[PDB]
Design a protein around this ligand. Structure first.
Ligand SMILES: [Cl-]
Length: 249
């Protein structure tokens, strides 16, 4: 077990890195890394592949059709492409996408990916939050997955061990790339932000992979802090600092 607590600056959380080469896990906070939680918008990694496999989308430019709804997040207020929906965590785009897939197809794909509890029973999500259609089974609802299960899922997808087409995985890699001000390393990832009302803790995520020289690491960074200021973007900042201090040369 490793200690990346310095990069969390007192925020409650954990981190797990996996190298498919030597099959070794680098684990900070084992109990937290093994606890299942809602994936929130990190589910966009898998929903993007489901949409491509089923022909609901076909490229980084694919649009889903904007109905003119004025959302609080003004970055959602247009007919945005797959790459923009991924980067802006656009829930309306991904709900309209998954609504065009039979639950049985989603169930079979999650079961084959071993995506945590694979529970999509609350399809429409938790309507008790008053958000209406801005909800889904992957947003503080029935679907739950641990940080370790996220990295096991990432490894199977990007090492070619799933049924997804390599062409579709390459589209996902492209939209997952993030700029970290260091051409020597390639970082890919998706943020997730939610609040677990029952337990009064955030679900703040940054899930992805690091490609450095001759090594690839699949990673999941997670916070369960009490402070609602702790969001996916903040956990992404922590992830980049962990990568800079413990995964550089
Ligand atoms: Cl360490």
């Amino acid at each position: 077990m490793v200690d990346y607590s310095d990069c969390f600056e007192g925020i409650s959380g954990g981190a797990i890195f996996y190298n498919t080469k030597n099959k070794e896990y680098n684990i900070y906070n084992k109990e937290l890394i093994e606890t299942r939680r809602s994936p929130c918008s990190t589910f966009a990694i898998v929903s993007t592949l489901i949409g491509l496999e089923k022909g609901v989308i076909n490229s980084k430019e694919s649009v889903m059709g904007y109905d003119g709804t004025e959302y609080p997040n003004k970055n959602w207020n247009k007919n945005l492409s797959l790459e923009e929906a991924f980067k802006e965590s656009c829930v309306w785009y991904y709900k309209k996408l998954i609504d065009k897939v039979d639950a049985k197809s989603v169930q079979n794909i999650l079961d084959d990916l071993k995506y945590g509890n694979c529970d999509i029973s609350e399809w429409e999500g938790d309507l008790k939050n008053g958000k209406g259609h801005l909800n889904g089974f992957w947003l503080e609802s029935s679907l739950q997955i641990s940080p370790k299960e996220q990295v096991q899922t990432m490894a199977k997808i990007f090492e070619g061990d799933t049924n997804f087409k390599k062409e579709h995985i390459n589209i996902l890699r492209d939209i997952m790339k993030i700029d970290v001000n260091d051409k020597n390393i390639n970082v890919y990832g998706k943020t997730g932000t939610g609040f677990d009302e029952k337990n009064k803790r955030v679900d703040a995520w940054f899930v992805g992979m690091l490609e450095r020289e001759g090594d690839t690491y699949y990673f999941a960074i997670k916070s369960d802090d009490s402070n609602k200021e702790i969001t996916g973007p903040k956990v992404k900042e922590i992830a980049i600092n962990i990568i800079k201090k413990y995964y550089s040369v």
